[PDB]
Every structure is written in C-alpha cells, then in structure tokens.
Design a protein around this nucleic acid. Structure first.
Ligand SMILES: [K+]
Ligand SMILES: [K+]
Ligand SMILES: [K+]
Ligand SMILES: [K+]
Ligand SMILES: [K+]
Ligand SMILES: [K+]
Ligand SMILES: [K+]
Ligand SMILES: [K+]
Ligand SMILES: [K+]
Ligand SMILES: [K+]
Ligand SMILES: [K+]
Ligand SMILES: [K+]
Ligand SMILES: [K+]
Ligand SMILES: [K+]
Ligand SMILES: [K+]
Ligand SMILES: [K+]
Ligand SMILES: [K+]
Ligand SMILES: [K+]
Ligand SMILES: [Mg+2]
Ligand SMILES: [Mg+2]
Ligand SMILES: [Mg+2]
Ligand SMILES: [Mg+2]
Ligand SMILES: [Mg+2]
Ligand SMILES: [Mg+2]
Ligand SMILES: [Mg+2]
Ligand SMILES: [Mg+2]
Ligand SMILES: [Mg+2]
Ligand SMILES: [Mg+2]
Ligand SMILES: [Mg+2]
Ligand SMILES: [Mg+2]
Ligand SMILES: [Mg+2]
Ligand SMILES: [Mg+2]
Ligand SMILES: [Mg+2]
Ligand SMILES: [Mg+2]
Ligand SMILES: [Mg+2]
Ligand SMILES: [Mg+2]
Ligand SMILES: [Mg+2]
Lengths: 134, 131
RNA sequence: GGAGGUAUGACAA
RNA sequence: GCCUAAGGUGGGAUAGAUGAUUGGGGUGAAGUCGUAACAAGGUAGCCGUAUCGGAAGGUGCGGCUGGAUCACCUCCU
RNA sequence: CGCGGUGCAUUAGCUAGUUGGUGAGGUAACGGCUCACCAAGGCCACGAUGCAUAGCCGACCUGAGAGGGUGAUCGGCCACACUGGGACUGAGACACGGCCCAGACUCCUACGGGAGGCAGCAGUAGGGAAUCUUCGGCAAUGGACGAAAGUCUGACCGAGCAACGCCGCGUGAGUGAAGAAGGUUUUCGGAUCGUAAAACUCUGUUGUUAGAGAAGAACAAGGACGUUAGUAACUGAACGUCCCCUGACGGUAUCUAACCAGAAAGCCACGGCUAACUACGUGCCAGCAGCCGCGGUAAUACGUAGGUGGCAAGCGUUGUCCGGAUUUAUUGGGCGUAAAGCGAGCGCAGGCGGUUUCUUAAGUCUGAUGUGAAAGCCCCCGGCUCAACCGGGGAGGGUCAUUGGAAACUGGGAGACUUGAGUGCAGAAGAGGAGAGUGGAAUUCCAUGUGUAGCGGUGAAAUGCGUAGAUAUAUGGAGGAACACCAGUGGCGAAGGCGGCUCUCUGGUCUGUAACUGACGCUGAGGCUCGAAAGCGUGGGGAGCAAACAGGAUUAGAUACCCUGGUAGUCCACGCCGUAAACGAUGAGUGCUAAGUGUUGGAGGGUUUCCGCCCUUCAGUGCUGCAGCAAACGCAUUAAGCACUCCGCCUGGGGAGUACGACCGCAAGGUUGAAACUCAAAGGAAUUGACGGGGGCCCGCACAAGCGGUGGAGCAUGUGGUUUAAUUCGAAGCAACG
C-alpha cells in the first residue's frame, strides 16, 4: 500500500484465539453470566466416563470423561496414564491440552488432584500422573 | 505525471550506470545541480556541464568508471519522497555503508553531505543515499 | 523448429 | 407550592436464554447408487446465466484457454 | 484551554437549554449554572450519536529496535463506601466507621416501635484452580487533641503463615583400586555405574550445646546556667550549652567456644527438532504425543530398570503475555500463473504534483530557558561479610511550552516562465456511436409446371416426410435473420464491443505547426455513468437455430452424448437486471534503460521521368531478443526492468461468498459479509517416472495368410470342490493345475 492508504486504513493484525477456551471463562451465579477469567485449571463434574476411538492412522480405546465445568461449559477431557478411578458424578480437575487422536478432546484430567487418583505402579515421570515417591 | 524530479534524476543515473553509458542528460533544477556538484566533488562522477536552453536548462553528467570499467557508483536511493518526507535531526544524520557512501542532506546551510552536516551539527531533509 | 487465428477396483503394509 | 429519588401504568427499543419443528454444514479404518473431473478421462474443460434431472451432472446461449491431435497462412529464429 | 492515550458504521445522523444573544438571579468564581424573553443555531465521514469495554499515570513484561502486552505490590491523580436520592454542619464533605428519606437484606420488640452496613485490621461463610494471624507495640517515623506530662493512632513499625518470587549458602573436603562387593549389560573376554563406595586424614558454612550481647533514641518533659529582642522590673518568649530521661522487635541480629558428617535432594528429559541409550516387558493392545509421528510379537518414541543429559530446593505441567512471526512488513512484504488489480469509464472531496525571482516561515533544523515529582530501569559512587537489597550523585525520557536563530527542502504570499496540460491553425485514418432507409446470397414456407418412388438420417439404425405426388427441378411470391469475397497478431472504441451499402446527427484519436493560455496537471475513497450472454416486464416479430419437451436410438440403466421434431429464447421498441476464464487472469499517470524484423495511420528529406525506392521521425499494432528481473515458467521501450505519485486489493485450506443485518432488484438475484467448528496441510512452477479409449517410429507365430488341434465322446493324468478316521504338505492369472 501507499503511505496515504496506510494512513487511511491502517494495518490490522489477525486476532489469536485460545487452544483451551473453556478455561478462559468463569461464571457468576448472581448475575448468571460468564466472566472472562483466565484460569490454569478448572474443576468439573464427570457426567460421562467411557472410552473413545482415535482417528484413522491410530487405533485404541482412548479413555475420556464428559465433564461439565464449574463455569457451566460442557467439555470432553482425556484421562492420561494407565488405569483410573473416575466414575460419573466424580469431581475432576482439568488442565489444557489437546489430544491429537481425539478430534473433540481439548482438555486433560489432572491425576492426583480432587477425586482423580494417581497412576498405579508409576515410577518414572511421577509428577505427571500424580504419584508420590515410593 | 512526474511527481519527483529528484527521484527521476537518481534513476536516470542508476539506469545509465547499469549499462555503463558514458554520459547522461537531465532537465535542470537548482537541487539537481546541487546533487550533481556533490557527486562531482565526492568522486562519484567524472564531470558535470550545464547547458542553457529555452525551457529550464539541461545538466549533462559524465559517469565515472575505474580500471576494467568497474562502477564507482553502486546504487542510489531516494529517501525523502513526496509521499513521505524524511527529516533527521543533527544526531540522527545517517552514515551510509559506514562512511564508504554518502547521504545528500538539505539543510538551512544548503545541500551538503552527511559528513558536512554532522560537522556543522545540523539536520535536515535527507535527499538520497549514494554508495 | 516455436508463436495469437480458424462401468468399477477392502484396509494397512 | 416548585423541583425530585423510589414506586406504578403504557407503547416501543435492545441483549441472552429457551421452543414443537426445520435448514444447510463438518465429522465419522473399511455401507448403497452411479462415474462427473484428472489422458482428447473416452461428449475438451472451465466461467456467468437459464432450464431440466435420484445423484453427481445434462442441455441451451455467450465467453475463456488455464486445449489433446492432425491439417493451413502470417510471423519469426 | 491546547495536545495525547480503546474497539464497532453489519453504529450517520445527533441536539431543543439544545447553539447564541439580551437582562435577571445564583456561585468562591466565569458560564444556560438557572430562569424569563429574542433568535436559531450547535455537532458530524478530521467519525457526531449509539453500542461495547476500561479507572488513568509514573511504571512493569517483552523486543535489535520500531513496537506489542500489562496497569499487582510502591507513588501521584480520580472515583466510590449496602442501592438511590437529599441536604445539614464546617475553612474544607454533599462526609467508609455522620444525619434524613426511600429501597433490598439481617436483627430486636411488650406490635406501638427500634437497630444495623468490614471495598478499615484480623477473621468467618460463599464463590473459586487460587491467595495469610481473629498476633505484639506504640519504642521509631508520621498524624489528631493539649501549654505540657500526656491520651488516641489495626497509619505505621514489628512478629506469624505460604518455596509465591528474587538473592546468598549448604546437603561436606582431601587422598583413595588396572578399579572390592552388588546393579545393569555383554560378542561372556570384559564393559559400565566408579575415585564412586570402602578406608585413612580433615572441616564446621550449617546443626546442637552452652555462654557473650547490638545499633535502631532523636527526643519531649524536667533540673541547671547563658545569649538576644522587649520590659520600670520582671516571670516568660526565641535561641544556645550541660545534667537527666525512654526498645514493641528481643536476649533479635551478631559474636565466641565445644561437639558430630553426623540430621539436610529432587524433578524432568534422553526418535528428530533437542543436550542425553541400552536392556527387558508389551505386540495398532496397553499407552505416548508440542509438532512430525510412535505401537500391527527383535519399538533408543509405550511401561520398568541401568546408564545418561539438563536444571537444582527446586523441577515439571497447565494458563496468560512478548519473541521467534517480515504472519498487517513505518522501520520491514506483496498482488501474470501461489492469497491478492474493482468489468470499464466520468468525476466531488482528499493525496501528490514542472521551472524560476523575491518574500514568508506554518513544516524542518538549531541555541537558550522553563518544566517533564519521588521511586524505578541505566550510569557513576558508597552501605549491608557477598548478592538481592539500601543510600547518594547523575543521566535519560516530550512529535511539551516560551523565546532567539538558520532558510536548502515542503507549505503560504507577490511575480516570471514554457517543456506538462489544454486552445487555435493545417492535415490523416477508422466494423467508434445513434437514427432512418436500402442490397444481394442463402434457408424456410407458399403457389404453379415437370416428374416418380423414394427422401432423410446413423457407427449401424429407426422415428420422421412421401402415391392426399415427396425429395429433386423450373418459375415466381412472402417473411425473418445474418451480412460470402474483401478480411489482415488489420482497424476503431474506456471496457462490454463494433463487419453489406447509403444518407443524417455525433464522440474520440493520430500527425504537423508553435499563433494563444501559462501547471490550468495526475490519481481519485464515496458518488455517478456504461456494461457480453442468459434472465425479467410491456408491446411487436418469428425464417433459421434451439434450453425445456416429445418421439427414435444407444445402454446394464441414460432423466445424456446420436437421430427426427420442437416451445421459450435468439430479433425489434421501451424499461429492468449489473453478472462472466467482463482475461493480457498484468489498475492508472510519468520518466528512464541494447538491438533486429513485420505491419496500420501520419510527417519530413534524398533519389527516382512518375510509380517506387533510400533515410529520419511520431503514434499504434505484432514477432524475435540483451541488460535487468523472476520460485520457475517466463517478461523484456506495448516490461513482469529501473523509479516517483494516487487508487483497488491480499494475509493457510475448508466452513463461505455461506449465515445474520443492511442497501438494491418486479423476480431471478446482486452488493456488503462473519463466526462456531475443522484440517496440517491447500497451493505455484518445474523434475523423474508411470500411464493415456495422445502422437510418431519399430519388433516378436502378436495379428493377418495357412496347416493341424483344444472346447463335444471314452479313457489317462493333475487341479478345484465335495467326501473321509486320513483323503499328507507345497504350487494358483500370464509366470498354479502329466
Ligand atoms: K463432462
Ligand atoms: K473478452
Ligand atoms: K445568558
Ligand atoms: K474502574
Ligand atoms: K454511588
Ligand atoms: K467518618
Ligand atoms: K507514635
Ligand atoms: K480506643
Ligand atoms: K521521638
Ligand atoms: K520423545
Ligand atoms: K512497507
Ligand atoms: K482489468
Ligand atoms: K519554517
Ligand atoms: K470524426
Ligand atoms: K423478452
Ligand atoms: K513499428
Ligand atoms: K481456520
Ligand atoms: K482346475
Ligand atoms: Mg515421557
Ligand atoms: Mg467420466
Ligand atoms: Mg468429459
Ligand atoms: Mg480437460
Ligand atoms: Mg435434457
Ligand atoms: Mg521483531
Ligand atoms: Mg465499615
Ligand atoms: Mg555456627
Ligand atoms: Mg542429540
Ligand atoms: Mg521411553
Ligand atoms: Mg511483527
Ligand atoms: Mg487457480
Ligand atoms: Mg490467483
Ligand atoms: Mg440478450
Ligand atoms: Mg466478478
Ligand atoms: Mg513500436
Ligand atoms: Mg491367425
Ligand atoms: Mg474333452
Ligand atoms: Mg505359499
């Protein structure tokens, strides 16, 4: 563009968006509205715990939880590690992070937090998966 | 239409220099004569002669080439433009290729080189870079 | 030589 | 007595939620129907428009070459 | 009061005490601040109004910088104190811990009526991923009151809690084996963990035990004297000098001595990016993953172990911001084919603009002064044992103001100029446009002779037409549409487009000349005009052609391609529509930068008896081709080269040119134009292959030309299938099956 054009219509940049939008919104019970609060995690209740299938290259029975968050948003989350003690109506803590296999899964469940148990038998990378030192 | 006769003068030199023409002619103006004189005494062109005509005069420039016809002028860039005038303060006066080139600056003391401008401790409108 | 015009076919490997 | 918060009534404006039902869209390791495009893709393709057809698409009109092949004159090396 | 710091027009209209005036009143004060009158203005595409969001700043994070992000703690300003309104008191409040009223909420009543407001310090409940003790003291500093002692001060000094952050120090040091045991792993030799451990000699930062003990205090008050001013004299006031007087922290820092290495390390990573590799276990499972991707029975990528790497009282994960991202490019990108030139013009505003004299000096440059608080980064300099941290002295920071200068450049003013641009004069060519006529060829139909069984059509056919006389042929008549030859990368036009001929009206361009004007120019958002074909409306026309449609074929099916028909439409008038691979897929203007060769319209000169040839030149139109440019293809004076001006437009693919809103349209639709969500690609050019119901050139019992067979019969044999206790296993298109 010419300088006069940039004066008339200045440069404008693409707006970025979150990879984990459900963590960006709080909820106000009084006003019954959604607040814009960036939160590293969020507590939710497991409405459904089950297994899911991956996309074409991969094949497994990935373990998820359909979690309704404290901010009223309904999200699909992944249960990392081997074996878990989650059930429906359990209270789980969600962190950000996609799972490339699962198209609709944008959050991971934090192990060792709230009702989520640490991973049995884990001995390496224990801080992930939430297991105490043996 | 022509909106920047200075840029036209610099481009005529650049294009003639590219094909190693011996000489070049341009419609005359005071600023063009000022620029031609600076190129003359800074050793970028061989000579400059002026022709009195009926319209505005003509300035003839004699381009300079070294042994093996190496080009003394590498390129010329217009800095201040009709669309965006460029002004530098005395402490903002540019150095072109760390002093191996020159910047032609218009000041209230006249049209001078970047060396002269920061000697006098003055700024002005930056006309062109020459290296 | 060059140029404008006038039926169907798993998946991975 | 004037001003006046709140409250009441009235008709509009505006924002979200929700609603029988409805629309196209995206997704989904191995469904049905055809084979429209890519070679001249077996009717060259595409563009706009109109019209018709289960469906891709077909057909008309104008346009484009981002056109395969053989056959011409101009041009030019 | 000037200036400065958010988003949205898919927000353009807003305003009526509103704008101004005249008086009056009111205020500390000017003022529509209020009012009564008289006018009607004010604001706004330089973004009014509306909507959404937000306390602002010093500063903080990031970045090479330009910038981007943020506005905790500390300081300044502002605003608010249960929600709304009001005034009182006062120098000051419309007043967090004041009043009044109203409201919602909690609480007390004897039911008549009363009370209350932690966004003060703690603390509780609730919300949340998530933030502290219902602590000591007023000693210090500051604040209120008092003459003062002093009282009050959840300011503030301290202490407590949390690795929440930053900084410092540890968890030992030295010697110590061809290298113990054990772990892991082996090619069983040895490797490796490893000088690591052990052992021996040391150390006490720390820790424990005892002891020693700060600064932070200056004071005030009071007790002594003294000096000034004043006074008759005083007490006292102001000041000066001595004595006296006070520690929350707290027995805290700190120091000293003794004693023991004794109590004091983890976390993540190790396929590539990316520093660090092997074993088992598991076998598309379980799981990993930031991206690419790992896992399908021999996985450095999953889980464990041994090693190893990085960092270390932390380490990792998630969230958020800047960077890398030139990925909005002012610094610092693009638009022929990758995303991107509006279909084209005409033009308001705006942006930009030829030469020159004088002048001005708004921009620009420069000097001085003022100011840009302190703290902070930075720079010196000191203090804490170092550092963090603290203190002192600077510097920096403004598109700041005031004032003095400069004057080239941009701008303003007064002149001058002729090259750009235009006018005049003289010429040139043209399917440029509009209107009204008109010509021949051909098709169809119609009439009439001649004439006889076909005609028409396809790959092959049939439908169809014809003995109610076809087609063909001859002579005529009617009507519509299109204009053979000329005709040409030829011409004209802004583009779309314009092709018989004649006339009328009409636009533009090109070439000379240099009489005239004297920069009058270029571009041009918004607006306006034009805009192929199809389509739409009204009224005409209708030969040929032909969506639709009918019939005949083809075919597995054919709602196609083919055939025979055929309506709209194609044509005209008028009014709509406003889109096209509206393309050179290349916006417009200007200047500059090798050559060669065609051609259209001019001009000039040198020859030629003319005709014409030769050369120079202007404006088009092509081809070839340097320099340069380009990812390549290619472009190349008709640039995609080198430059300046203005406009349009682009920012991964899909969802979408979709939805919603708006404008336009009779309608069809057009113009404007997202998001959720999803993918890690989409894409351009070129390369090597393979392939083609592409082309060219060849070969082989490949076909053709022949001879004899197989497929039919019986039987032999192999195979499939079936059967079986078993009918052993292998081979399966050519290339398994005597
Ligand atoms: K087709
Ligand atoms: K065209
Ligand atoms: K007044
Ligand atoms: K605020
Ligand atoms: K308030
Ligand atoms: K008070
Ligand atoms: K005090
Ligand atoms: K008290
Ligand atoms: K004191
Ligand atoms: K890895
Ligand atoms: K730029
Ligand atoms: K165009
Ligand atoms: K000036
Ligand atoms: K004419
Ligand atoms: K019509
Ligand atoms: K030519
Ligand atoms: K996207
Ligand atoms: K067989
Ligand atoms: Mg891992
Ligand atoms: Mg096909
Ligand atoms: Mg086809
Ligand atoms: Mg094709
Ligand atoms: Mg059809
Ligand atoms: Mg940068
Ligand atoms: Mg209070
Ligand atoms: Mg000690
Ligand atoms: Mg490596
Ligand atoms: Mg691993
Ligand atoms: Mg950037
Ligand atoms: Mg394309
Ligand atoms: Mg494109
Ligand atoms: Mg039409
Ligand atoms: Mg278009
Ligand atoms: Mg030419
Ligand atoms: Mg044969
Ligand atoms: Mg037989
Ligand atoms: Mg086998």
């Amino acid at each position: 563009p010419t300088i006069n054009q940039l004066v008339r219509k200045p440069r404008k940049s693409k707006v970025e968006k979150s990879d984990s939008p459900a963590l960006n919104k709080g909820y106000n019970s009084f006003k019954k509205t959604q607040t814009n609060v960036n939160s590293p995690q969020k507590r939710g209740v497991c409405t459904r715990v089950g297994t899911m299938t991956p996309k074409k290259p991969n094949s497994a029975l990935r373990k998820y939880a359909r979690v309704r968050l404290s901010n009223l948003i309904e999200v699909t989350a992944y249960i990392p590690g081997i074996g878990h003690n989650l059930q429906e109506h359990s209270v789980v803590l969600l962190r950000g992070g996609r799972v490339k296999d699962l198209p609709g899964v944008r959050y991971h469940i934090v192990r060792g937090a709230l009702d989520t148990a640490g991973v049995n038998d884990r001995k390496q990378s224990r801080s992930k998966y939430g297991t105490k030192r043996p | 239409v022509m909106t920047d006769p200075i840029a036209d003068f610099l481009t005529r030199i650049r294009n003639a220099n590219m094909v190693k023409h011996e000489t070049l002619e341009v419609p005359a103006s005071k600023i063009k004569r000022d620029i031609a004189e600076i190129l003359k005494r800074e050793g970028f062109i061989r000579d400059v002669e002026y022709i009195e005509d009926d319209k505005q005069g003509v300035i003839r420039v004699f381009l300079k080439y070294g042994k093996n016809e190496e080009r003394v002028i590498t390129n010329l860039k217009r800095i201040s433009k009709p669309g965006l005038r460029a002004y530098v303060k005395a402490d903002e006066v540019p150095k072109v290729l760390n002093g191996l080139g020159i910047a032609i600056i218009s000041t209230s003391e006249g049209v001078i080189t970047d060396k002269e401008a920061r000697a006098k401790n003055i700024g002005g409108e930056v006309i062109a870079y020459v290296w």
